[PDB]
Amino acid sequence: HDAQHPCQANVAVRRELHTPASDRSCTHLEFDIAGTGLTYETGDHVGVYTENCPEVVEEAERLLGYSPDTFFTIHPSPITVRNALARYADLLNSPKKTSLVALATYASDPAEADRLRFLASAAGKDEYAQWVVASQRSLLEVMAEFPSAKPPLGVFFAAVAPRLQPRYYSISSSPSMAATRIHVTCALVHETTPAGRVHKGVCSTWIKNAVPSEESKDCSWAPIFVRQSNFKLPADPSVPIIMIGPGTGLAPFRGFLQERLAQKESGAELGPSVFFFGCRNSKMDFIYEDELNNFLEQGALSELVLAFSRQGPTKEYVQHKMAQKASEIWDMISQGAYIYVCGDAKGMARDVHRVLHTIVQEQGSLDSSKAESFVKNLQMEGRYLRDVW
Ligand SMILES: Cc1cc2nc3c(=O)[nH]c(=O)nc-3n(C[C@H](O)[C@H](O)[C@H](O)COP(=O)(O)OP(=O)(O)OC[C@H]3O[C@@H](n4cnc5c(N)ncnc54)[C@H](O)[C@@H]3O)c2cc1C
Structure with missing residues (x-):
């Protein structure tokens, strides 16, 4: 296959991830790649072609x-x-x-x-x-x-009119746990332009309303393809990792947790792993709550620190929970930890980026230019990865 020129893949499951109490929506979708030449790896992107409303x-x-x-x-x-x-x-x-x-x-x-x-x-x-x-x-x-x-x-x-571009999604599944299905975690987009036009996201609406084979034969389908990424887990499990993506930024880490859980059903020692997750409310958009706790029951994840955007008097985000944990994450870096960031690139990433700049100073005793150039070297070393949109 060729990535750009798609494979007629079928949608097997399509489910809402938020509770009915939530006023937003996020869809869990699985494409059926059985009988197709498509192959994917943990952390890869899946390009999806859709159609206009x-x-x-x-x-x-x-x-x-x-x-x-x-x-x-x-x-x-x-x-x-x-x-x-x-x-x-x-x-x-x-x-x-x-x-x-x-x-x-x-x-x-x-x-x-x-x-x-x-x-x-x-x-x-x-x-x-x-x-x-x-x-x-x-x-x-x-x-x-x-x-x-x-x-x-x-x-x-x-x-x-230019061509209707495909929309990319960070695959939320591992081939070891499901080599027959490409999982996607897609938030519904629905905004109002400054000029007052009600805009429904083209792809996120098509995904939210797609008919899955699990509910009917006359089921939806989309031309899809896989794009190789450098958002990958380290070579051996002993290397500790730090994952930060909140909301839809959780997507690739679900495959990250599926990949290492599969390996260590037969693999090696766990190695420390910490997932910084954030959302609005545990009763609203705590997506994949049951699955997350299962990964902690086994040896996949080791610690899951949560940040709640609208649950309680203190409005918390993943970077606020990072500065509190600024002592142990520094320890993790010296142990050779890889740090992953996924999700919103305009705010969350910018704020997460400038909060580990400030905790490598207090917990590192470097000033700005020395902390800045140090973080840059983590990127060049390949230990600081960002998958943001
Ligand atoms: C590598 C990568 C991974 C991604 N992973 C995920 C993921 O796991 N989950 C996920 O939900 N999303 C992910 N995204 C984002 C996703 O690809 C889409 O961008 C998103 O779902 C919206 O697509 P859409 O078709 O619904 O939106 P569109 O219809 O393209 O809407 C895009 C935005 O543009 C705004 N807009 C509307 N009109 C205009 C205009 N005239 N000019 C400018 N802007 C306008 C809209 O309000 C909207 O906010 C990822 C993106 C990338 C690049």
């Missing part, structure tokens, strides 16, 4: 004016407009400037065409940055703003 496809058909019963060859052999808009057109992301140039070329209203060309010009870079990018206006909202821009079928797919 039907209402989004409808709005595009309204704006474009094509006959959805038109067959054409997208540079499936021939495909209808509706299915090309569903599976191959990114409709909700913001149009690039070259896409605006193409819209203007077909805008029959002088004022609208002038405004489109302006938005793509250097003189318009400031208005483009605010009205398109900062407001997260979709291509569909731009086209409604300029209803005279009617590009032909070929131009639209070649220059106006």
Whole structure:
């Protein structure tokens, strides 16, 4: 197989991970790779191809004016407009400037065409940055703003809408525990753009609503593929590890705990392992709670320190639980520990990154530049891994 060009894989199980008391959602999904050439390793990513929501496809058909019963060859052999808009057109992301140039070329209203060309010009870079990018206006909202821009079928797919990208997920299973299934842990995305558009995450919604073979024969399926990563466990189990990913950052570590549990059903000494997990509330989004405690019953995990974002008077996060445990994690580093970080890259990672910078000082007696350059060397050594998005 080839990673980029997918394998028609089937969804076997699809389950909600949060309690009904929770007001968010996170899905546990398993792809069935039996009878396929797909192989994966612990810590790898699975790329998933999806399709647009039907209402989004409808709005595009309204704006474009094509006959959805038109067959054409997208540079499936021939495909209808509706299915090309569903599976191959990114409709909700913001149009690039070259896409605006193409819209203007077909805008029959002088004022609208002038405004489109302006938005793509250097003189318009400031208005483009605010009205398109900062407001997260979709291509569909731009086209409604300029209803005279009617590009032909070929131009639209070649220059106006880019391809619907696959969404990547850090596999949450180990091949030793399930070489027939690729597990994913996918949080539902549902936000409101600054300009007020209700956006449903394209892939996370398709995963949340997918029909599993465990509940019906007429079950969902997706073209999937595996991407090799460097988010890997050390060579031998004696090496201690530190895992920090909260929320969906738990994903790869579930395979991490499955991999080492499988090996040491027949392997070697456990070696210290500590999992820093965080979530909103033990009654809401403590995903995989039972499975986590089972890993602690056996020798997989050794200590699971928890941070609760909205359970109690003190709002805690994984980095707050790290500074309290700053004494033992330093000991772990001198014992040669690998440190893993997975999950949100904008805040959690930045805060976790700048909290072990500050505890390698107090517990290391280095100043800033010496603590900074030291942490950098842990990365170059390959002992400080980050799988963030
Ligand atoms: C290596 C890797 C591993 C990952 N692992 C996981 C995992 O284990 N679990 C998991 O849940 N996720 C994971 N992700 C993230 C995941 O790939 C998706 O990004 C996420 O699920 C949302 O996909 P979606 O299709 O639902 O979102 P999209 O529909 O792509 O939405 C993406 C975001 O863009 C915003 N947006 C909407 N409109 C616009 C616009 N016009 N311009 C700009 N932004 C806009 C949306 O509000 C939304 O927040 C991973 C990502 C990477 C790179």
